[PDB]
Design a protein around this ligand. Structure first.
Ligand SMILES: [Cl-]
Lengths: 117, 103, 113, 113, 115
């Protein structure tokens, strides 16, 4: 449960530009409250903020080449969301993410396939 | 036998722009779908799992045999994917396709 | 002791890749090391000793490192350890006196390095 | 550029590959991050004299994923984590305020993605 | 105390397990153990003692070396340790580099063949 909001990629590109690769482009980005899940043409950037003021911030880059396998499991009911599991090389447990209402569930999967296969 | 024209229709939206269905096998009520880029294990109510294993992530594999059992080991992890290939499954075909598409 | 590869190509044909060919093979008691242009296939049988047959395919890129340890003993037995990508524990194979231990090592070198 | 790369190339040359060349370097207080065409070299000094020196090479092809997180009092510092092929635990480097944390991130992106 | 090893002699010894296209680059002996750099791999040769009949030949292709480190004790105290991380092995191989070793050349060799 909870909704994901699409993020404007022109503004995001200006704000992330300094930590982006010279030939990197943004494909897709979602916000969930303060956190962001960013698809570039080279990696996922997972931006997680912690604390009341949200000043404890991490940027976790997951290059697509580190995603060794992945899975989508459809929701059983309208009340539930589909689930994305991403296995990252060297990490035993998958990163599990709810494909919240508001996400392009098929586009997300197509992007991972476009950049990771 | 799996209707590949139909399956290609249903999986079409989650395929890579440069990706196309090649072959599929039924293994019980589940499916092994082979595209040009990955093996998709489709296991089933309204709840289905689509587990993609890119060919480039398969490090080694083994078939032991009577039913057979397939282990597919994946880059960056200890544990294999394990699949029972019961009498009825095209065991030789699955092995040929793994060889053709990964090696 | 020598493996007839023409016969072996015919037996393995159904699981080989369309671009794959056999290069060399070595018998180890009832088991075989089959080197193709793409992979080592370790074929393990129990034969009279059991029901199991295992065809274990190791593409050469997945061999991360390897070791041969020999007995300091009259038996002249050796042991091969193959470490395969993603596993910390080696696949281990006893190579008893009579095995072409040197040959298997040179071939692992030629195909994996 | 933080440092004179022509000088640095002369200094590091003896431990660099014949077809390896320096790209960029960053000071991390008394430590250094040296980016070549093939690896990141972390040059770290220990002790008040800095007599104990380590050169830790991480080839770009071995970096699987990475993370930068805020650290320290009032989140003014940063911590870089580099995960490396074939191991669970990351290489962790503390990047204290004054370091070009943004530049280092861009350069890792440029060389590892 | 490490001794340098004659490579023409060693090539004759190791030739039967070497790749047809492989060549020896550098080798050190401590008692009867050897650390061999070829152009394709490290070979770690471990014999128990001075006559212990058992021997281990551990081959580490350069591709399996995921990262590596040289740390030195001092500005004038030249003892050094080489650490080599091998894919899938948690602990690094640690080689002490004391008298008789060429610490620069070892580093050059690893850079040339691993990178
Ligand atoms: Cl480490």
């Amino acid at each position: 449960g909870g909704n994901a909001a699409e993020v404007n990629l022109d503004e995001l590109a200006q704000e992330l530009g300094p930590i982006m690769g010279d030939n990197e482009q943004l494909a897709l980005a979602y916000r969930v409250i303060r956190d962001m899940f960013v698809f570039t043409n080279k990696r996922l950037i997972l931006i997680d903020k912690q604390g009341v003021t949200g000043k404890k911030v991490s940027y976790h880059s997951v290059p697509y080449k580190a995603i060794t396998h992945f899975e989508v499991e459809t929701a059983g009911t309208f009340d539930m969301d589909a689930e994305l599991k991403l296995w990252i090389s060297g990490q035993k447990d998958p990163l599990v993410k709810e494909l919240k209402k508001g996400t392009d569930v098929v586009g997300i999967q197509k992007t991972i396939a476009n950049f990771s296969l």
